[PDB]
Amino acid sequence: VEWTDQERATISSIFGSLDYDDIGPKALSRCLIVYPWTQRHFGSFGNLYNAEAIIGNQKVAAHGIKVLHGLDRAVKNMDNIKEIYAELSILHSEKLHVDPDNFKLLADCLTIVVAAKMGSGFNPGTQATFQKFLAVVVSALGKQ
Amino acid sequence: VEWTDQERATISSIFGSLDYDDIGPKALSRCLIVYPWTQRHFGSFGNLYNAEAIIGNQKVAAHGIKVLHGLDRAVKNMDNIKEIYAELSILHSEKLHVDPDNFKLLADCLTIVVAAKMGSGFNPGTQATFQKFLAVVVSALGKQ
Amino acid sequence: SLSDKDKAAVKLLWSKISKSSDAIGNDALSRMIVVYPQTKTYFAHWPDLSPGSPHVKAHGKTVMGGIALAVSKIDDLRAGLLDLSEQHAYKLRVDPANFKILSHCILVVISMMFPKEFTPEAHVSLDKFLSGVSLALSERYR
Amino acid sequence: SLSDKDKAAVKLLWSKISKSSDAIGNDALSRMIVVYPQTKTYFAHWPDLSPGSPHVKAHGKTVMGGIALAVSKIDDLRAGLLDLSEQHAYKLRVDPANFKILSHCILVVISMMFPKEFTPEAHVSLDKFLSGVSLALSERYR
Ligand code: HEM
Ligand code: HEM
Ligand code: HEM
Ligand code: HEM
C-alpha cells in the first residue's frame, strides 16, 4: 500500500472525531447481529439470543472498545500496519481461532456505524479512504 | 446563451418540485425585507414597517406567486427567454418604474429560498444551472 | 431465506425510506463508481452521477425501483427479478461481482440518511434481503 | 452601519451555527469555485474542495474563523479585519470583486443548513454584516 498526505490526514480526522466508547460497542454488536456466526467466540457463559442481549453483553461492548483502540496504532503508523498487527494476528488465529473472513465482516459493520455518525460528511472520497485503511488492517490481521 | 439537455432537465426538475404558493410569497417578502427599497412599488395603501407586516401583506404574497408563474414560461422555452419577457419588461420599466437592479436582488432571494427548500440537493452544479437560468431571465426583464 | 420477521422488517424500513428512494439511489450509485472504480464503465453514460453535478431523479429511481419491485415480490425474489437478471446479464453485461458492491453502498447510504431507523435488526433483515436480490439477479449469468 | 438589533441578530445566529462552521466554510468555498469559476485559481492548491473529496476541517475553519473574528469585532469591522484585508490584497492578491461572491455563497449554505434559523430578519442583518466584512476586507486594495 502507498499513502498520500491527504489520506493520512483523512484517517486521522475521521478517527479523531469518534467517541470510541460509543462507536466500538456499536460496531461489534452490529457484527454479532448481522453475521451471527461471529458470536462463536463470545457468550461462553451468557447467551446471545437476540439483539437486545448482544447489545447488553458487557464483554462484547468491552471488546468493541478494544477494537477501536487497536485501530489507533495503525492510524498513527499507516506505513507499518502489517508489522504492528503481527502479534494480534497470531493471537486471533492461534489462540482465539477467529476466521479471517470475520475481520472483513467487522470492517463492513464499522463502516456502516461510522457512516451513520458522519452523515453526509461520509462522502464517496471519504468512504474510499476509510475502506482502504480498513482493508489494509484486515489484510494484516487475517494472516494465519 | 446556449443550453444543454442536462441543463434544460435540471431547470424543469427544480421548478417541478416547488410549491409556487409557498415559495413565491417567501421569495418576494424576503426581497422586501433584505432590500427594503424594493418596497417602493408596494404598500400604496397599507404599511410595511417590519417583517411581520411584509410577510402578512396580501398584495406582496400574491405577486410573489405571480413571479413564480411568470418564470414557467421561461422553464418551458429556455431558448426564447428574451422574446417571451419583452412585454413584461416594458410593463415593469415603462408603467411600474421598477429599477432593473431590483430583478437581480429578487433573483438572489429566490436562490436563497430554493436552497432552503432543496437542502443538500442544492449542490454546486445545481446552483450553477439555477443561477444561470435566473440570470438570463433577469437580463431579459431588466431591458428598458 | 427470509423469515416472516425479516419480511416484516424490510417492509417497515421500506415504508420509512421509500419517499427518499431517488436520493438513496443517486447517492449509492455515485459512491459506488468512486469507491469501486471498476464500476465507472457502467455509468459513464450518466455524467450526472459525478459528485457535485445536478441530480437526475429518474437515475436514482431506476435502481431503487428495482428494490421497490423486490419488496413487492419479497415472497419469490427469483421469479420476481428474473427479467431484471436477464437485463443485467445479457443486455447490459454487468459483471456479477458488482451486485454485492452495490448492496453494500445501499446499506451505507441508508445508514447515513436514516441512522435512527437503520438499527442492527433492520440491517440484518435488509442485508439478507439484498443477498436474496443479488442471487436473483445472478440467476441468468450461468 | 449595523444597528444594535442587527448586531444582536448576527450574534444570535452565530451562536446557533458556529458549531457547524468548518462544514459551512467548506461547503461555501466548494460551491464558489464551481459556480464562479474565476475563483478556482485561488483554491486549486486545496484539492479537497473538489466535490466528493474528503473534507479538511481546517480549510473550512480558515474562512469561518474570519467570520468568527468579525463577529467578535462587530463594533469596528474596519479595524478588526485590517490585517485580513492586507493578507487578501497583498499576500494573496485576491481580486476584490470576489468578496461579494463568497458572501452570497455563505448565505446560500446557511439557508441550506439552517433553514429554520435563517429567517428574513436573520438574513437582512447577516447580509448587512457581510457587506461590512467585504468593505473592511476591501480597505487595503486602494
Ligand atoms: C480490527 C479488528 C480487530 C481488532 C483491532 C481486534 C483487537 C483485539 C484486541 C486488542 C483484543 C485483546 C487482546 C488481548 O487479550 O490482549 C482482542 C480480543 C478478542 N478479539 Fe479481537 N480484534 C479485532 C477483530 C476481532 C473479530 C472480528 C473477532 C471475532 C468475531 C474478535 C474476537 C476477539 C475475542 C474473542 C477476543 C477475546 C480473547 C479473550 O477473552 O482472551 N476480534 N481483539
Ligand atoms: C422574475 C422577476 C419578475 C417576474 C417574472 C415578475 C412578474 C410579474 C407579473 C406577471 C406581474 C403582473 C403583470 C400584470 O399586471 O398583468 C407583475 C406585476 C408587478 N410586479 Fe413583477 N415580476 C418580477 C419582478 C418584480 C420586481 C423585482 C418588482 C419590484 C421590486 C416587481 C414589482 C411588480 C409590481 C409593483 C407589480 C404590480 C403592478 C400593478 O399593481 O399593476 N416585479 N410582475
Ligand atoms: C441491487 C442490485 C441492483 C438492482 C435492484 C438494479 C436495478 C436495475 C433496474 C430496475 C434497472 C432498469 C432496467 C430497465 O431499463 O428496465 C437497472 C438498469 C441498470 N443497472 Fe442495475 N440494478 C442492480 C445492480 C446493478 C449493478 C451492480 C450495476 C453495475 C455495477 C448495474 C448497472 C445498471 C445499468 C448500467 C443499467 C442501465 C441504466 C440505463 O442506462 O438505463 N446495476 N438496474
Ligand atoms: C467573507 C470574506 C472572507 C473572509 C472572512 C476570509 C477569511 C480568510 C482567512 C481568515 C484567511 C486566513 C489568513 C491567514 O492565513 O492568516 C483567509 C485566507 C485565504 N482567503 Fe479568504 N476570506 C474571505 C474571502 C476570500 C475570497 C473572496 C477569496 C477568493 C476568492 C479568498 C481566498 C483566500 C485564500 C486563497 C486564502 C489562503 C488560504 C491558505 O492557503 O492558507 N478569501 N481568508
Author numbering:
A (entry chain B), B (entry chain B): 1 to 144
C (entry chain A), D (entry chain A): 1 to 142
Question: Can I see the authors' text?
Answer:
Here, we report the structure of a second carbomonoxy form that presents several structural properties that are unique for globin structures. Indeed, the distance between the Nε2 atom of His59α and the oxygen atom of the CO ligand, which are at hydrogen-bonding distance in canonical carbonmonoxy Hbs, is 10.3 Å in Hb1EmCO_hexa. The most evident one is the strong electrostatic interaction established by His59α and Asp48α side chains. The inspection of the RMSD values shows that the quaternary structure of Hb1EmCO_hexa is quite different from that exhibited by Hb1EmCO_ortho (RMSD of 2.16 Å).
The globin fold is made of six to eight helices that constitute the matrix where the heme group, which is deputed to the ligand binding, is anchored. In this scenario, we have undertaken the biochemical and biophysical characterization of the Hb isolated from the sub-Antarctic notothenioid fish Eleginops maclovinus (Hb1Em) that lives in the Beagle Channel surrounding the Tierra del Fuego (Argentina) by experiencing temperature ranges from 4 °C to 10 °C32. Particularly, Hb1Em exhibits the Root effect (drastic drop of oxygen cooperativity at low pH) that is physiologically necessary to secrete O2 against high O2 pressures into the swimbladder or the retina, following local acidification of the blood in a counter-current capillary system.
